[PDB]
Amino acid sequence: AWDYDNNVIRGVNLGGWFVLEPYMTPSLFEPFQNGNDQSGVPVDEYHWTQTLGKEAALRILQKHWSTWITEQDFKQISNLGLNFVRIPIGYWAFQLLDNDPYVQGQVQYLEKALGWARKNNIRVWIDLHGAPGSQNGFDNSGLRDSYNFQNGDNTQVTLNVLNTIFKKYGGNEYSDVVIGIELLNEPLGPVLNMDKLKQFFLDGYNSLRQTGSVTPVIIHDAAQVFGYWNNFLTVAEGQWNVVVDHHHYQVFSGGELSRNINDHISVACNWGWDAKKESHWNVAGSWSAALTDCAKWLNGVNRGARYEGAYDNAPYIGSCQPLLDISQWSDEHKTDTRRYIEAQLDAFEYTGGWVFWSWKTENAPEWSFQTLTYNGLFPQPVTDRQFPNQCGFH
Ligand X SMILES: OC[C@H]1O[C@@H](O[C@@H]2[C@@H](O)[C@H](O)O[C@H](CO)[C@H]2O)[C@H](O)[C@@H](O)[C@@H]1O
Ligand Y SMILES: OC[C@H]1O[C@@H](O[C@@H]2[C@@H](O)[C@H](O[C@@H]3[C@@H](O)[C@H](O)O[C@H](CO)[C@H]3O)O[C@H](CO)[C@H]2O)[C@H](O)[C@@H](O)[C@@H]1O
- Taking CB under 6 A as the rule, does residue 257 contact ligand Y? no
The residue among 92 and 271 lying less far from ligand X, judged by its C-beta, is: 271
Q: In angstroms, give the least distance from the CB of 61 to ligand X.
A: 36
Are 177 and 114 in contact by the 8 Å Cβ rule? The answer is yes
First and final C-alpha spacing in the chain: 28
Are 148 and 154 in contact by the 8 Å Cβ rule? The answer is yes
Size of the site for ligand X (CB under 6 A): 8
Q: In angstroms, give the least distance from the CB of 82 to ligand Y.
A: 17
The window from 3-11, 104-112, 252-260, 358-366 that contacts Ca ion (CB under 5 A) reads 252-260
The residue among 208 and 323 lying less far from ligand Y, judged by its C-beta, is: 323
- Taking CB under 6 A as the rule, does residue 191 contact ligand X? no
The window from 30-38, 62-70, 103-111, 250-258 that contacts ligand Y (CB under 6 A) reads 250-258
- Taking CB under 6 A as the rule, does residue 298 contact ligand Y? yes
Considering only CA atoms, which of 248, 255, 310 is closest in space to residue 274?
A: 248
Q: What is the CA radius of gyration of the chain?
A: 20
The residue among 42 and 272 lying less far from ligand X, judged by its C-beta, is: 272
The window from 60-68, 225-233, 257-265, 378-386 that contacts Ca ion (CB under 5 A) reads 257-265
Q: In angstroms, give the least distance from the CB of 138 to ligand Y.
A: 5
Q: Is 186 tagged catalytic?
A: yes
Residues 6+ apart with CB under 8 A from 391: 265, 268, 269, 272, 273, 343, 346, 347, 350
Which of 77, 218, 242, 323 is close enough to bind ligand X by CB under 6 A?
Answer: 242
Considering only CA atoms, which of 258, 247, 324, 371 is closest in space to residue 23?
A: 324
- Taking CB under 6 A as the rule, does residue 57 contact ligand Y? no
Instruction: Answer with the entry of ligand Y, ligand X, Ca ion, none that 241 interacts with (C-beta below 5 to 8 A by kind).
Output: ligand X
Site for ligand Y in 348-367 (CB under 6 A): 357
- Taking CB under 5 A as the rule, does residue 259 contact Ca ion? yes
The residue among 21 and 278 lying less far from ligand Y, judged by its C-beta, is: 21
3-state secondary structure of 308: helix
The residue among 1 and 235 lying less far from ligand X, judged by its C-beta, is: 235
The window from 221-229, 239-247, 250-258, 382-390 that contacts ligand X (CB under 6 A) reads 239-247
Q: Is 296 tagged catalytic?
A: yes
The residue among 136 and 250 lying less far from Ca ion, judged by its C-beta, is: 250
Angle at 54 between CA 52 and CA 57, to 5 degrees: 55
Taking every pair of Cα atoms in the chain, the longest distance, rounded to a whole number of angstroms, is 60
- Taking CB under 6 A as the rule, does residue 281 contact ligand X? yes
Which of 240, 316, 374, 393 is close enough to bind ligand X by CB under 6 A?
Answer: 240
Sign of CA dihedral 334, 335, 339, 340: negative
Kindly name the residue from 186, 308, 349, 366 that is annotated as catalytic.
186
Burial of 260 from C-beta contacts in 10 A (0-12 / 13-18 / 19+):
exposed
CB atoms within 10 A of CB 67: 8
Kindly name the residue from 296, 342, 360, 366 that is annotated as catalytic.
296
Alpha helices in the chain (DSSP H): 45-52, 54-68, 71-79, 106-119, 154-169, 194-210, 254-257, 261-277, 331-349, 369-374
The residue among 185 and 241 lying less far from ligand X, judged by its C-beta, is: 241
CB atoms within 10 A of CB 190: 10
Tell me the C-alpha distance between 316 and 314, whole Å.
7
Tell me the C-alpha distance between 50 and 94, whole Å.
18
Q: In angstroms, give the least distance from the CB of 394 to ligand Y.
A: 26
Binding site for ligand X (CB under 6 A): 5, 235, 240-243, 280-281
Residues annotated as part of the active site: 186, 296
Q: Which residues bind Ca ion (CB under 5 A)?
A: 259
